[PDB]
Amino acid sequence: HHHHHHMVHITLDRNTANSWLIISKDRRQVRMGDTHQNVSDNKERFSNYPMVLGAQRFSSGKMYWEVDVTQKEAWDLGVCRDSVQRKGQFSLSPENGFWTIWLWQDSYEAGTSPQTTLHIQVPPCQIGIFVDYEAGVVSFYNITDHGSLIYTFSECVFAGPLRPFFNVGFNYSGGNAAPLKLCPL
Ligand SMILES: O=C(NCCc1ccc(O)cc1)c1ccccn1
Numbered sequence: 298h299h300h301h302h303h304m305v306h307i308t309l310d311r312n313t314a315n316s317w318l319i320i321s322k323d324r325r326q327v328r329m330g331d332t333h334q335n336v337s338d339n340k341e342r343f344s345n346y347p348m349v350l351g352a353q354r355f356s357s358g359k360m361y362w363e364v365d366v367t368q369k370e371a372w373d374l375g376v377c378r379d380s381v382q383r384k385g386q387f388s389l390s391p392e393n394g395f396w397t398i399w400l401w402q403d404s405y406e407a408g409t410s411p412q413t414t415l416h417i418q419v420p421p422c423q424i425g426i427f428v429d430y431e432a433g434v435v436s437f438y439n440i441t442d443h444g445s446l447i448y449t450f451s452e453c454v455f456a457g458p459l460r461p462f463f464n465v466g467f468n469y470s471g472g473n474a475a476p477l478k479l480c481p482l
Pocket residue numbers: 328367368474475476
């Protein structure tokens with residue numbers, strides 16, 4: 298792809314984080330802690346899952362960023378509406394305001410309803426995410442495999458400002474402690 302020139306500098310919004318997440322000083326990395334991280338609760342925090350939003354809001358234009366997923370067993374990545382549900386149980390779907398892909402139990406899937414199987418020959422260590430607001434497109438790229446396309450959501454109905462979306466996943470196995478990292482431009 299040739300989307301790299303739309304690169305944006307994403308930072309994580311501490312106030313939206315699940316209370317077990319640990320965000321680095323530079324707000325560019327996040328991992329699952331082994332306990333509650335001693336923060337107050339608020340209506341913005343994701344309660345049920347290890348999720349956090351980017352601070353940046355997008356309502357127009359073309360945006361691109363990259364995320365490092367090295368040595369993770371489970372994660373979700375993409376964008377979501379600013380007004381997505383934060384509390385209780387929900388599925389990641391465009392009907393609920395999410396445009397995402399994930400790794401789970403050694404398979405990759407797009408967060409459609411129902412979910413769509415992805416075909417990845419080279420397990421990615423870094424994911425590129427492209428958003429074209431006006432066109433209604435969210436695309437995912439395999440940076441480890443020379444930028445090959447993973448998935449395109451088209452005919453998106455964003456219906457609000459968008460925020461970068463992250464889920465570091467649970468670590469029940471002891472094999473999923475590694476962080477998500479926003480990669481440098
Ligand atoms: O699991 C990982 N590191 C643990 C992070 C940590 C744990 C405890 C602590 O006190 C401070 C830092 C990892 C990091 C990079 C790639 C893969 N795995």
